[model samples]
Target: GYEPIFPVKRELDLKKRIYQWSDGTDGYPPHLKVDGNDEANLPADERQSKPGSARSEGVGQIFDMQETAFVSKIAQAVSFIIPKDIDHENTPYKGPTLADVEKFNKAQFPKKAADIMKGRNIGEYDDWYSDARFAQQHFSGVNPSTIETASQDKIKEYISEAQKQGLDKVKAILEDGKDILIQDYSYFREATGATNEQIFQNTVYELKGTTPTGKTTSRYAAASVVIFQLHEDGRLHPLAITLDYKGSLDNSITIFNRRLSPDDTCDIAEKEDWPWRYAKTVAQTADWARHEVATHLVDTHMIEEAIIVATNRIIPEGELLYEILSPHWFRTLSLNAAARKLLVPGVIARIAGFGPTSPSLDFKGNNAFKLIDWSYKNFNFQDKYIPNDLKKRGFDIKGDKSGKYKNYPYANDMYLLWGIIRNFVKTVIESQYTSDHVVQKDPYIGGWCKEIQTNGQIPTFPTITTVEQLIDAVTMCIHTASPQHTAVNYLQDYYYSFVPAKPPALCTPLPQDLSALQGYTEKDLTAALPIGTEDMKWKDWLLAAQLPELLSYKVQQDYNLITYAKSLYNVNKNRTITENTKFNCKTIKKAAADFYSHLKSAGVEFENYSKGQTAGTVEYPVLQPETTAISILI
Candidate 1:
């Protein structure tokens, strides 16, 4: 009954991959450049290409010495932060225990080494694990885009899928005929046109016999499917969570939350439902996996890397396109280079429980990477345009008809910035190209489009037939690397640093029986995680803590979106060299000032949405242009 918007491969492919480069090698998207091209190799006539200078590597090349040092600094910082008890792959982290977390909550090394133990999710609120907060994550958490309104037919299908009486109660909750929402990861397994009912039956493929890590434990990937209901009291509340979507009740344990309110008490029966928390943690774990690989790595980093590869290969440095897009392109290719070289292999590879090998290893086996490959091919310019995406996701973008969903901070704030980005990009584009015909005929525009389609293999790419089309396309690219990336990238430390809130990999295997899940207590919850070790410990939680701090480094105004864009159009700087080109530099400089002013207006207005539903807690402001970096530097 459900279908994906973007076209994709039928299933996970081993040799064929996502996150590639212009010529299609691995790392940038032909599979990316073989090594050697640098953005320093830019400038129209500066090429004396040779062994010491030429970039043969693809967009993954980290040729700049200082930028190389920055990645080194991040790696070194992580190295120093890792506790000696937890540093080795063989040893893993056992102590610092759950006891340590509770003690830290009570206050610890007071001149604070405290941020490490507190998370934005759990540590920030009174009764932080309540239903309102669980539902809030759909709008304000990492990978907010995945939640969508579930249809009546789909609800019935899943009810049939469950083949049980308990889940049937959800069928009555749709009194308004518009309340159900689904945050599904079952799409990772469903492409064969059968109902997910059939696909979720994969015992062997889903979590059975998954390979273990080097020392501590076996790896796993949960195809979790969680559903929610927007209630009469104007709060989105959790309904059912399918812990591991393996179709049969045997493996797929669906647990229902007893109440929607945080105010009233849950009787001992509901209060003792430990599996509900574990299931929510299952959803969070699955969501984190996707956020790291699909949202941050592939969508932000690799998408920009593909563009960088194609533009470097085809577009001239002297062209109008370079000046318009190049500043936004700062430090990205090198950042991606560091990601492939260090982040993926050193961090993601070693820590994640998806294990090595789908059919023996590398990214092909990881379920997150599989989702990335599926989504990347499905990506298209029209579908990705901010307004269009929101509308398709069931929000009424114009008339304020979002209703129960109206307070969505991420979606509303993103719309504001999308307009700001497009308005700025449109102003710059209008100053240069006089007509649609000029945009169509521009050699750099046409050449670069063809290069991405052919060499870069950019998905669902549209031709730039008009100036308006060109403006929208460029705005999307700028948004992808800047605000879009920042929305997912900068919040890692806040949510993920405290692994109890969002552990990257669960230490315990998923429960097979619903009764055993009901039998699970607080000790069971921590036992399911990396901390409650009976036999051996896995340092994955410790590794998860170290990597995100580096990933979510502080955002400064120096490399800010509006700030860096203006630097390219600085008041005192240019006109001597750019005067030789056809584009109007004087007009662009004037527009950049307006762009800068507009962001302040948007920032002040949008800042209200960051405040949480509960007492003055912050929800999401990661997309604010003031805080967003111009590139994927982390």
Candidate 2:
């Protein structure tokens, strides 16, 4: 619902239709590039097929380096500003403690540190300040001989040196810091009444724009805000001033006279919507939507009825959602033993729900980071032999019954979440979500709605319930990440990227419930919406037909969003190039679907086929094939 402030500046091949090709893998879909190909001493012609160098060891190929370098550099740049206590893996930082943050806040910027701290979410510190840069400052290459080992007087001397150069010398640092802060301010200014820059730069811009009135209060803060018109080339963009209001915290909050006619409250709630509202949305519904979108996108291979096919060339049989989810979720969950079990997998599952089953790297259960690296490179396609190589190196895909990859509760939960949501959709259209009601007949049963709706809650949309009293009540729990809000801190918007609020405060009880809903299941929901065999055929075909573009868009969007995030959040930052390791395509696949479903349901129109004819509303055309459950009976 929140429109993107920073639109993806990359010019899309808009000339192309959404789904141009309908057949053949040649130019068929992006899947060719989806999973990386191999080349080792294959005839020189084939080896040099794609431009670049090659590597023999599975350590990483030339392609892996390119992608990782392109992506990770942005992350590295932003990392500079993150707090010292956290890093890439152990993030949403809970380990380092808030006291460190309070100390940093107090010491770094003495005058306005408390004011900054006042607005931050609970347990979320590293987000406000980029720990990446902080890492570079301290532990990056070596402990700076001056800052790290310096005495108190020496430290003071360094601070003096940093400042004595004046605003001109420090302008770059301030600009970078301001760039991050601007992301927040831009969103808040549009969504809410508060302008942080105005609050930050009141004294400086007071006389420049509008002068104060009534109470005649003097301005104290001075900040410069530049609004840019986005362009493909990052360089050339101009800045402008929209509205410069003069006010401090006290003056901004309440009228000095205490008796204002129309204005009495400051209402700074928009800036703090992250943890309470935004993150909750990610936790609850983003994943479900991701799958729906993914199912709509893929080409019906290896997946039938939305079920992923195992390597044994067999589909497991089960009605219980957990059974389907346990294997995959448990497998992934084992990779990161240190991860918060209840939290991470659930979030990833929510993400996985977006598209198609991402092929696993199964890095032979080697190091978790190893799989992460491998997956990034091969785009997550790991079959047995590939994994066997890692096993040869003393690792085994982490899912062997007796070995280390035991608990994948997170992945399991995602499986369950996806199944339930998908089945819920199927059952709803079939009039099976609830029980069939009997009129003057022998058997009578209670009826149910298509989707479980709460008071004023949209049926298809997700909800974010929060404990913190920072923002009003519950957060806007939409599925996908948005410029203004998202469940995860580092995730970018599928559509746009802009100032992100404090990674929605470290949300606890992510789902806020073990059971997704108070009362519901595939059976209960399906019973309400009875689907005849005839109806299933039509629904199935429509789903199949619509899947490829759905899948393609997920891939396209994933790359696009990451690009946008890097451009906006990771702007002008440097990151070290790690060994050319692959990215986790499985995770990417899951994440794509999870977000896709969330976004599609937010606005997508699902079609219902008419029985052997065109009878339903022509405006929302049903895919032509056969009878669909929701189609009007002839």
Candidate 3:
């Protein structure tokens, strides 16, 4: 479907480009040096007394040891310094003797002191003791009635009041109909050519769509008002946050009050209709009290496919286009990989209630490239050769590797394999090519491969005889190199020489007889593709043309894209005018007028806008979702 700019040749030399064997010698990016040496132990008083000199004394004493043993030693030694009452865990027998103190101060204190020094050097410290102290005094050892002055009923009422207050706060924010400004810590910028003052703002709105049966349905979609001020160092300062509340008020308060454990956070609907849940564990705090729980929740919640959809849509308008003009090569790759590995497969699994748990592959972008490559290597071909992990899940693939299961189809079935690739493109790969955050982040002059271009010429590799051989070789190379080796490592040296240097256009052409699809029968597109229906018939040759990557591109034809493009054209055209006298004042004004009209259609007429503001002055649009009746399978 897509092509690499350079032709792939067979049998190319890699030499020093891909890798150089580790010399088996200790080297740069220094490994932590943990050795059994007593020279590092120093008493706390002495360690802090000399300041700079004391830090130097414990320079190489950091050790990796059992957590309980380390805590025991620290507690045993610290008991000597802390008063008996304050040291809740302390008992007379647990106290270190004189000889024990000497050993600890010599062997353990140096390492501990060095760690504190190391943390301070980095402008922070892991004051683990502070947390332990707080827990002991407030939660652990203290009698509940002695420490907690509030009556049990009063405590319950307080919690209830907090929950109600949080619910009202969110509800009021939504009903006010003002654009919410979410703070983005990652590389972000305001829409191009917009204000650069104290704050630049963009808006996302939640709108209603009409179903074919004429019923109004809520899409759970949102529009963002991205407000930020740019820093000279190319970072953004975020100012606000807004999104449609899908779950009950109780859940909202649960998140706001930070009551959930890491596991409990999974139930949040922040990424409903997408795979945001797959990475819920990655972003969770091990202990709710261990960090700023609200802050962590916000970070994880905002970087979802839903938010990206609201901001960028398809065809790269608003923040999406702005991101394209602004560049961050590595961040781009990371987002792409995340969408492919975590986001896309995650969504498919959610919608179907089954599929691959995760892509679990080492690659960026979920496209034909990755699918073909992974299948040859990962897919099992023999009945006796089921993956051990699959067997553990009691899939019964051993009995009949191709038989369907209650929750999912058979692993080795061709239908399952096809569905995997189909949904990957439908969700993950399509989002990158058409959505704002993924595609618009690409460099303006070249394709995705341009991000990988370095100081020297791009290497050309050999093409293999068959696609199967190519995938097998690349898979073998990745396995041989190590799981930690990046996609770049394999791309430059793997047998598959081809790498995409350009992206397909944002939208594809609709079928000639689109009106017929208005009454299209509801059937499994998977089965429909292979068998012709009376209402709409197509050949197997045409089935590939309708996948999400190809079909989702219809956004290019939307009114939103047309008007936004006109506005951007006017801005660029106004800037490049050779002579001021030749400027067409009416043409520029017309472009601005149309852009505002597009924004109005986008459901962005927030009540906060000034009464006298013109659409051109106060509103704008970039791109919007396409209008299509063809239902996509999960």
> Tell me, what's the RMSD of every candidate?
9.4, 30.0, 30.4
**TM-score against native, each model:** 0.79, 0.18, 0.17
Tens-place lDDT digits, model 2, residues 1-634: 8866532222112202211211222211221111222233221221222322232212112122243332223222221133233224422211133333234323332221111122222113332322222111111111111111112342232234334434233323323322111100122222223344323111101121233222211111111122222122111111121112223221211101111111223342312322222222221122222122121111111111011111111211221111212122111111111111211222221112111111112322212222122222222111111122233322233443432211212122222223323332222112211222211121111010111122111232222121121011101110011111111111111111111211111111122222332232333212211111221111111121122111111111212223321221111111111111233333333433553454243222122111111221011111111111110000
lDDT of 1 by residue, 462-493 (tens): 68899888888888888887888888877777
Ranking of all candidate structures by their lDDT, best first? 1, 3, 2
Cα lDDT, model 2, residue 370: 25
In order, the Cα lDDT scores of the candidates are 0.60, 0.20, 0.21
Q: How many pairs of residues collide in model 1? A: 30
**Tens digits of per-residue lDDT for model 3, 203-272:** 1111122112222111011111112222222122221211111122222111221212111333523323
State which candidate has the highest lDDT: 1
Candidate 3, residue 7: how far the Cα is off, in Å:
23
lDDT of 3 at 609: 19
